[PDB]
Amino acid sequence: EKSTTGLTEAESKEFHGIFMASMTLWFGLVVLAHILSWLYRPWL
Amino acid sequence: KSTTGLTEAESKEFHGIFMASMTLWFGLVVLAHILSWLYRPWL
Amino acid sequence: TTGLTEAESKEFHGIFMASMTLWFGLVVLAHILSWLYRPWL
Amino acid sequence: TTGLTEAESKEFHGIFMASMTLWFGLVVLAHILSWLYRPWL
Amino acid sequence: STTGLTEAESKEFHGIFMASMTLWFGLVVLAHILSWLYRPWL
Amino acid sequence: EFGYITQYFDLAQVTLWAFWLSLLSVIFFNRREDKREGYPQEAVQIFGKTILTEGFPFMPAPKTFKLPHNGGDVVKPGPERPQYDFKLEQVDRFAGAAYRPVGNPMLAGVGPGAYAVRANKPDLTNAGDPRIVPMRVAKHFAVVDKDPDPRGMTVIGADGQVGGKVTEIWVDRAEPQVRYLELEAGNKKKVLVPIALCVIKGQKREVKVRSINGIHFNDVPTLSNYDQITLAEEDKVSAYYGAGTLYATPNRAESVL
Amino acid sequence: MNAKSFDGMHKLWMIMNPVSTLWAIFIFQIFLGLLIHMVVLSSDLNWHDDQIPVGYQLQGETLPVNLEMKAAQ
Amino acid sequence: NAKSFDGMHKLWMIMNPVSTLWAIFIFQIFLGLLIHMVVLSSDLNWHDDQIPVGYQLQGETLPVNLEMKAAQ
Amino acid sequence: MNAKSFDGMHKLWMIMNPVSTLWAIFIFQIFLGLLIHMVVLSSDLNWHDDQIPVGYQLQGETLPVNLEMKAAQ
Amino acid sequence: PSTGLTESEAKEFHGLFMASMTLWFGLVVLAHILSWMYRPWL
Amino acid sequence: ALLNFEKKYRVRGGTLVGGDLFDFWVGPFYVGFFGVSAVFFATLGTMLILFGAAIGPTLNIWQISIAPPDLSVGLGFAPIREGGLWQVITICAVGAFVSWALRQVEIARKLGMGLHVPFAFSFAILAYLTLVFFRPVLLGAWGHAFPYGLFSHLDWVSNVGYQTLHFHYNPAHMLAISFFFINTLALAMHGSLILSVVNPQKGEEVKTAEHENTVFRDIVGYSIGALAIHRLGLFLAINAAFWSAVCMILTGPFWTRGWPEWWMWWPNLPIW
Amino acid sequence: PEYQNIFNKVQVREPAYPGVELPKGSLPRVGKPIFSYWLGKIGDAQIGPLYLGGWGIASLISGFIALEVIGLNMLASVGWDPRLFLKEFFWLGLEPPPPAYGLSIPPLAEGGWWLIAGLFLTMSLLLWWVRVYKRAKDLGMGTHLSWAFAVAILFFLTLGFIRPVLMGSWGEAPPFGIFPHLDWTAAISIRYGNFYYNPFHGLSIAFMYGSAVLFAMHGGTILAVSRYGGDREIDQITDRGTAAERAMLFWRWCMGFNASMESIHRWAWWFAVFCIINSILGIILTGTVVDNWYLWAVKHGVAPSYPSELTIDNPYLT
Numbered sequence A: 001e002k003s004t005t006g007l008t009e010a011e012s013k014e015f016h017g018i019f020m021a022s023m024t025l026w027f028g029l030v031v032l033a034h035i036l037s038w039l040y041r042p043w044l
Numbered sequence B: 001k002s003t004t005g006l007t008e009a010e011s012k013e014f015h016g017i018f019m020a021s022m023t024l025w026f027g028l029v030v031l032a033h034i035l036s037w038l039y040r041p042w043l
Numbered sequence C, D: 001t002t003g004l005t006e007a008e009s010k011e012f013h014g015i016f017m018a019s020m021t022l023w024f025g026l027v028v029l030a031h032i033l034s035w036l037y038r039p040w041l
Numbered sequence E: 001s002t003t004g005l006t007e008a009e010s011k012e013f014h015g016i017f018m019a020s021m022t023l024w025f026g027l028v029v030l031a032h033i034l035s036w037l038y039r040p041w042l
Numbered sequence F: 001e002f003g004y005i006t007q008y009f010d011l012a013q014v015t016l017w018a019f020w021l022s023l024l025s026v027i028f029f030n031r032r033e034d035k036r037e038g039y040p041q042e043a044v045q046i047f048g049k050t051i052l053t054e055g056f057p058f059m060p061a062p063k064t065f066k067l068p069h070n071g072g073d074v075v076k077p078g079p080e081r082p083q084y085d086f087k088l089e090q091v092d093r094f095a096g097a098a099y100r101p102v103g104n105p106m107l108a109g110v111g112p113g114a115y116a117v118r119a120n121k122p123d124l125t126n127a128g129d130p131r132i133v134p135m136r137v138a139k140h141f142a143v144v145d146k147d148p149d150p151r152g153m154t155v156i157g158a159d160g161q162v163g164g165k166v167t168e169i170w171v172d173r174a175e176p177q178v179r180y181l182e183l184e185a186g187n188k189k190k191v192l193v194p195i196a197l198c199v200i201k202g203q204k205r206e207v208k209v210r211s212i213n214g215i216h217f218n219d220v221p222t223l224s225n226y227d228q229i230t231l232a233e234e235d236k237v238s239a240y241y242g243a244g245t246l247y248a249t250p251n252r253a254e255s256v257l
Numbered sequence G, I: 001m002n003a004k005s006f007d008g009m010h011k012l013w014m015i016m017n018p019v020s021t022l023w024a025i026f027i028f029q030i031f032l033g034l035l036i037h038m039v040v041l042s043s044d045l046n047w048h049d050d051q052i053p054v055g056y057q058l059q060g061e062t063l064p065v066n067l068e069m070k071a072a073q
Numbered sequence H: 001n002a003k004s005f006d007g008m009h010k011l012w013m014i015m016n017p018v019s020t021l022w023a024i025f026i027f028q029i030f031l032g033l034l035i036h037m038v039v040l041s042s043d044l045n046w047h048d049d050q051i052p053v054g055y056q057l058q059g060e061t062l063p064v065n066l067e068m069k070a071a072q
Numbered sequence J: 001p002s003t004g005l006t007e008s009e010a011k012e013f014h015g016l017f018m019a020s021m022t023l024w025f026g027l028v029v030l031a032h033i034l035s036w037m038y039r040p041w042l
Numbered sequence K: 001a002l003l004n005f006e007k008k009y010r011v012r013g014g015t016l017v018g019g020d021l022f023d024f025w026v027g028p029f030y031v032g033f034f035g036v037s038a039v040f041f042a043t044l045g046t047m048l049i050l051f052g053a054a055i056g057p058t059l060n061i062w063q064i065s066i067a068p069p070d071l072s073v074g075l076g077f078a079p080i081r082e083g084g085l086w087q088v089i090t091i092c093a094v095g096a097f098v099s100w101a102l103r104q105v106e107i108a109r110k111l112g113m114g115l116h117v118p119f120a121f122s123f124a125i126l127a128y129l130t131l132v133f134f135r136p137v138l139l140g141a142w143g144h145a146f147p148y149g150l151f152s153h154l155d156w157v158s159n160v161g162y163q164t165l166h167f168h169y170n171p172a173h174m175l176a177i178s179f180f181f182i183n184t185l186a187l188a189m190h191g192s193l194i195l196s197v198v199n200p201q202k203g204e205e206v207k208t209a210e211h212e213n214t215v216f217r218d219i220v221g222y223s224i225g226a227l228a229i230h231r232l233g234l235f236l237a238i239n240a241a242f243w244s245a246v247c248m249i250l251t252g253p254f255w256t257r258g259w260p261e262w263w264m265w266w267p268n269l270p271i272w
Numbered sequence L: 001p002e003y004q005n006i007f008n009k010v011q012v013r014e015p016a017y018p019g020v021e022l023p024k025g026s027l028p029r030v031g032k033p034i035f036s037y038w039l040g041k042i043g044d045a046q047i048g049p050l051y052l053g054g055w056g057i058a059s060l061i062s063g064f065i066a067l068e069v070i071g072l073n074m075l076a077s078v079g080w081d082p083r084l085f086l087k088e089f090f091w092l093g094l095e096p097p098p099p100a101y102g103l104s105i106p107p108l109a110e111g112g113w114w115l116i117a118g119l120f121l122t123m124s125l126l127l128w129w130v131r132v133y134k135r136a137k138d139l140g141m142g143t144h145l146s147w148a149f150a151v152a153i154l155f156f157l158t159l160g161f162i163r164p165v166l167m168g169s170w171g172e173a174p175p176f177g178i179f180p181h182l183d184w185t186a187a188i189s190i191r192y193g194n195f196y197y198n199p200f201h202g203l204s205i206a207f208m209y210g211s212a213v214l215f216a217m218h219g220g221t222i223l224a225v226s227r228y229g230g231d232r233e234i235d236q237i238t239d240r241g242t243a244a245e246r247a248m249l250f251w252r253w254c255m256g257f258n259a260s261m262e263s264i265h266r267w268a269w270w271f272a273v274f275c276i277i278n279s280i281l282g283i284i285l286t287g288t289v290v291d292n293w294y295l296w297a298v299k300h301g302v303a304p305s306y307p308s309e310l311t312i313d314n315p316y317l318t
């Protein structure tokens, strides 16, 4: 009846772990880029 | 009858997490606006 | 692939090469006459 | 994939390389003549 | 085996592919050295 | 100076020539693809001899269609199946004269009543089932209300007389739509009529078939098995209804003015 | 190695069709020939209209017979 | 960092070699035409730069052509 | 976590097709290469038309042979 | 296995993918060092 | 010459005028009463175009021109050298076009099929008659029609367009152009789809109707069907022709300002 | 009269068809199919489902970013008023940079938004190209629909990117409006001396007229033999019936030659593609090679020469 993706609960836990790790790393790199840009050419 | 296949327990679970997430999002919005008002007041 | 044997291909090739040589000879002659009449380089 | 055996491929390759070399020779000759007549660089 | 090539056939193809690509890049480098000698652009 | 000229030859000119040559060359290839059906043609000579000619440009080399579900190979241009047995008399003694049917024009298979000789297999779906079937074999179909269900109506036949009554609908499973109406005729046979030759009046509860007359519904060709139809049978049925457009009344082939 | 690395090259024609390749090469060469001739004709290197070794339309306009006819008009 | 590229030859077990060859060749021809056209549209153009000499100008000032243009 | 958080990562290719991904990456890289070259050519950093280390069309217009021919007309 | 690769095949592919990406980024860095030496933009 | 299968279909009957006298073929063509008429009128019209080129300044193919009368002739009869030749040729043209349509009707009756093609041809004929008959009559002069010449009817088109300052803002013109563009798009997609289904990827079977539906539902979400695309085709082409006729009957007879000023009815609605 | 086969008189429903099975490794199709009675009067009644994969999502993100940009600039040009937006809608537009800026990137309210919208629309159409190609190829069909689409994309890029770059200005490209883009059409004809004397323009007009002619002819002919099963073209191709025979006799008798049931579709393909090929060729030469099409036509012996009778004095010569 209900919409499902075929993932069990263990597979979902696994995917979630790696997804959150990757997103955190990406945001870290973004923050670093903005600190460099502020040091070079402040916009506010 | 229109139905989603969720029972009442599943709906309760979904509702809990939905409300928590929406509250956190609105908190972040309020913080952004306080910073913007301190920097460049518009009214 | 074309149905020609090797003998038929040899025959065709003989006449094809003869004809092409004669054609190029006539072309060279036409250009010598044109150079004598109206040199372009 | 093409139905050619290895011997047929070797044969074709021999003649293909000979023909390409002759063609490039003629190209080089044409360019030497053009450089003698009208140098472009 | 998705392309039907075995591992030996793939090794063979890879050998010749790398040789050909190296030769092509060599010719490119030579063309650029001649062009720099004739008409330097930087 | 308003119209001074520097040089006569330009790029637009050359490019236009190139286009004239690129057309003039797709014409060639299309005209060659046009001749994979119906060729070589038959040219009649000075005193009646017939030869096969091929035209300009010449016919292409044969290509193959591989039909699905082991339906065989089709080579084109290739052989032809033999014509059946039409009888015709020429009207005037020259190669370009017209012909007259010899017997009963309705049952002759000449003129608008000619048909082709196709395979004796049904057309298939993507799953391997027969494509055109009655609505009792296809148990999932239903007529949308808002539309007149033709089952039950009568089949008035172009001179005002009754032909029979509609008893079944034949559907198309690959594209859901109606293709044939089945009816019981005056001599209690089951015959088909294509849906594209029927005007359906819901309130009169009639189906008007302008092609043939009422008594003509007794001689419509019949099917082998009534759970499917083959390509040959489709051709025969449709051609019989098309012969009536010129042969039903003796006045139909006779110069309006 | 640097000499034995092109040994199996002849096997190229076991995966590429020879007739199709020949036709493709010939057609491409003809197209490129036409294109380069047209590109060079549209530059300062043009050799039909450069009036070397002489201008022929100008030569026809100043023939003594044509000049004498144009004077009588 | 020298044993990192051992399994590379297996590339041709998932990519079709003939399709890849054709793709590479076609891309290279297109890029060749494009770069030649981009360089011909710049200050680096080598057909119209009149080096080592201008040929149309050379034809306009031949003594025969000059003497014919003077008679007009 | 934070030291061994990316150990499952190789499982990525059990949900994403490797050959499709390779092709997508290659095509995107070529498109981006063309785009960045065109964006930098349309700025003050342009390196084809800056006439450094010399202007070549201007060099051809002032050759002594061309100057002497243009004087004679 | 929505792609049909097992876990061993995925590990293999991942190894070579990461090596190739690292080499590519190395070449990019080298190109930018040369460009900075020739025409500094910041 | 006859096709492999042609002989059993060459029967007598089906005609409108004439009868058994003109019911024959000449080569592949079918003649009939209207075949004789059409060839008669085409030959006469062509020969008169050529003569009108002979009395002009040049026989260059691009620069021949036969022009209509002046506006002072009104709806009368012009001298032969100053407009009457144009009138005779424009009578021949109508005769030939209508003959063509009726011959089509005879052929379709003989083969047992519907009259859709002559019916669609009728709308081209109607557009021509709008440009040479209806618009001139409503404006009061034959000299409002176009001259017969390549390159010379284009000067007419240009100047007529600029008599309204900007002819792009004509509403029926916009609608007709919409139909023309959509028709070319539809024809490209239809051609491509049938070719693709009977010429599949190397070493595959001919595909089916389900494939035809699936491909467009995957790309776009809706598929119109194999019989409805033919309908959609007849529809788009006929509508293009129809709205062209309307746009020309509006220009001059029913509107004499600039065409941008018509549209002014919209921002002047008292509702914004 | 007789039934003309223009509308469906009786409709029938079965459960929706999900579609031919895709190769393994594919995403599912999104949407639950619905039925339209009014669409079923003229054609197929099912709407959906739809296939959204990698390339058709990147496309649709690009396209909607572009649409948001275009819409917002049109709305800023009236002062944000939606009432005025509806009132003057056919006159609004997003305008290209001033021609004096050349090929540089101008500031945002003086042509930079035009540049952004152009870039995003371009990327949208190229991603859609890849989608169309892969969708036809995964079902095992020939890729003929991608060739024609490629031609159309090339015409969009020619007028818009390639010609403005070859000229040296972004201000040579069309704006995004209705009446604004019509004004662009007229002005480019006026500046380069009369497009009626452009020969590629004449040839593309020949092929647009021909597209309308050919598709009226084909649509008519197949509706006229649909009583003999002619609307099912695949079977008439792989097993020629009486519908195809009558269809080809009609044209043979009428104009002396004919096509077959498969060949007419190649004629359609080419007539639709030559129109746009000549479009590209005519735009790419305008301005870059030819500066006045009327003077070109006069130099090559094409334009007629009306009698004069008068003399007008050019006041710049006096």
Ligand code: BCL
Pocket: A026, A029, A030, A031, A033, A034, A037, A041, I036
């Ligand atoms: C004055 C402004 C500054 C400037 C200010 C900033 C700021 C601020 C940022 C950037 C960021 C980026 N800049 Mg910058 N940048 C400048 C000039 C440039 C120029 C140039 C021609 O001048 C270029 C080509 C770049 C290009 C880039 C990209 C490397 C990066 C955008 C990543 C992205 O698109 O998401 C692609 C994202 C995905 C596909 C999803 C997530 C990525 C995952 C993990 C997989 C992708 C592979 C890999 C990680 C891709 C990125 C490579 C690097 C390792 C980050 N900048 C000037 C000098 N730039 C962004 C960045 O650093 O991100 C970290 C960023 O925040």
Ligand code: BCL
Pocket: B028, B029, B032, B033, B036, B040
């Ligand atoms: C003068 C005006 C101020 C300004 C005033 C504001 C105000 C006020 C707000 C923002 C908000 C945003 N601004 Mg701001 N902003 C300015 C200039 C910028 C510039 C720039 C290039 O100049 C950029 C790139 C941004 C970008 C952003 C985004 C981060 C954010 C909108 C998020 C969104 O749409 O979620 C849509 C997506 C979802 C709902 C999905 C779920 C979210 C996902 C998972 C994460 C998205 C990013 C997240 C919120 C931040 C990272 C996580 C946290 C670090 C934990 N601003 C200037 C300086 N901006 C809004 C915001 O931050 O709210 C939180 C907001 O209220």
Ligand code: BCL
Pocket: C023, C026, C027, C028, C030, C031, C034, C038
């Ligand atoms: C300044 C320029 C010169 C000029 C310079 C040249 C040059 C240079 C050449 C020609 C050539 C030709 N010129 Mg010239 N030509 C000029 C003016 C003319 C005029 C004219 C109205 O002014 C005409 C009608 C021609 C006509 C011709 C053709 C005979 C011939 C190209 C043949 C061809 O296309 O074969 C293509 C067709 C085929 C291959 C099909 C097969 C042919 C078969 C076998 C039979 C055809 C007969 C053949 C054409 C003639 C040979 C017969 C002999 C009497 C034995 N020239 C002016 C005066 N001309 C070409 C030539 O002479 O060819 C040898 C050539 O190289």
Ligand code: BCL
Pocket: C024, D023, D026, D027, D028, D030, D031, D034, D038, G026, G029, G030, G033, G034, G040, G047
């Ligand atoms: C300033 C410029 C020079 C000039 C510079 C050059 C240069 C440089 C070259 C040419 C080349 C060619 N030039 Mg040139 N050329 C000039 C003016 C002309 C004029 C003219 C009307 O003015 C003409 C008609 C030609 C015609 C030709 C062709 C013969 C040849 C292109 C061949 C080709 O495309 O094959 C493509 C087709 C194929 C490969 C298909 C297969 C061909 C087969 C094998 C047979 C073809 C016969 C072959 C063309 C000639 C062989 C004759 C000998 C007896 C062997 N040039 C002016 C004077 N020209 C090219 C050439 O000579 O090649 C060797 C070349 O490199």
Ligand code: BCL
Pocket: D024, E024, E027, E028, E029, E031, E032, E035, E039, G036, H025, H028, H029, H032, H033, H039, H046
């Ligand atoms: C100021 C600028 C210079 C100039 C600078 C450069 C530079 C730099 C380069 C070229 C290159 C090329 N130049 Mg250049 N070039 C100039 C003027 C010209 C002119 C002319 C009419 O003015 C022409 C016709 C050419 C033509 C060529 C091609 C031979 C070559 C492009 C190959 C290619 O497209 O690969 C496309 C096709 C393939 C890759 C297919 C793969 C190979 C296949 C199997 C067969 C190809 C044979 C190959 C074309 C010829 C090399 C054979 C040798 C005789 C051994 N140049 C001017 C004078 N040119 C490129 C080159 O030489 O490559 C090594 C190159 O890097």
Ligand code: BCL
Pocket: E025, H035, I026, I029, I030, I032, I033, I034, I040, I045, I047, J024, J027, J028, J029, J031, J032, J035, J039
């Ligand atoms: C002022 C600015 C500088 C400049 C600054 C830069 C900078 C900075 C960069 C480049 C990069 C590139 N530049 Mg640059 N560049 C300039 C002028 C040029 C000119 C020219 C006509 O003027 C050309 C033709 C190039 C061409 C190139 C390409 C070689 C390269 C982009 C490749 C790519 O898109 O891969 C996309 C395709 C793929 C990723 C496919 C995947 C891998 C494939 C299978 C292998 C391809 C090999 C690759 C081309 C390198 C081969 C070299 C060998 C290792 C010897 N530049 C000017 C002088 N250029 C980039 C680069 O070099 O990358 C390393 C780069 O970072």
Ligand code: BCL
Pocket: K097, K124, K125, K127, K128, K130, K131, K156, K157, K158, K159, K160, K161, K162, K167, K168, K173, K176, K177, K241, K243, K244, K245, K247, K248, L185
């Ligand atoms: C400055 C000029 C104006 C302009 C002024 C006009 C004028 C004035 C007219 C149009 C008309 C049209 N314009 Mg406008 N138009 C302009 C710009 C455009 C642009 C564009 C992209 O800018 C487009 C796409 C159009 C498109 C169109 C069409 C809507 C319409 C032409 C089709 C038609 O009439 O069919 C109708 C078909 C016919 C008339 C064909 C007749 C067919 C006959 C019966 C058969 C002949 C057979 C033959 C003799 C046989 C030869 C046989 C051989 C054996 C082969 N115009 C510019 C702005 N336009 C025309 C129109 O709408 O007329 C009704 C019209 O008069």
Ligand SMILES: COC(C)(C)CCC/C(C)=C/C=C/C(C)=C/C=C/C(C)=C/C=C\C=C(C)\C=C\C=C(C)\C=C\C=C(/C)CCCC(C)(C)OC
Pocket: I035, I038, I039, I042, L067, L068, L070, L071, L072, L075, L103, L104, L105, L115, L117, L118, L119, L122, L156, L157, L159, L160, L161, L173, L174, L175, L176, L177, L178, L181
């Ligand atoms: C209020 O509305 C909201 C926001 C809510 C959304 C609603 C959206 C609406 C109503 C939109 C209405 C849109 C209309 C009417 C659009 C009209 C469009 C028309 C008719 C457009 C016609 C032609 C335009 C063309 C041909 C443009 C071509 C542009 C091109 C090819 C651009 C090329 C630029 C490129 C590739 C970028 C290069 C940039 C760079 C960075 C490389 O430069 C160096």
Ligand SMILES: CCCCCCCCCCCCCCCCCC
Pocket: K036, K037, K040, K095, K098, K099
């Ligand atoms: C020998 C007896 C037959 C004579 C030849 C027939 C001549 C036909 C008359 C010419 C055309 C008629 C003019 C009008 C035709 C109808 C207009 C649509």
Ligand SMILES: [Ca+2]
Pocket: C040, C041, G047, G048, G049, G050, G051, G052, G053
């Ligand atoms: Ca010369």
Ligand SMILES: [Ca+2]
Pocket: D040, D041, H046, H047, H048, H049, H050, H051, H052
């Ligand atoms: Ca030079």
Ligand SMILES: [Ca+2]
Pocket: E041, E042, I047, I048, I049, I050, I051, I052, I053
């Ligand atoms: Ca430089």
Ligand SMILES: [Fe+3]
Pocket: K190, K194, L218, L222, L233
């Ligand atoms: Fe069709």
Ligand SMILES: [Mg+2]
Pocket: L175, L180, L183, L184
């Ligand atoms: Mg404007």
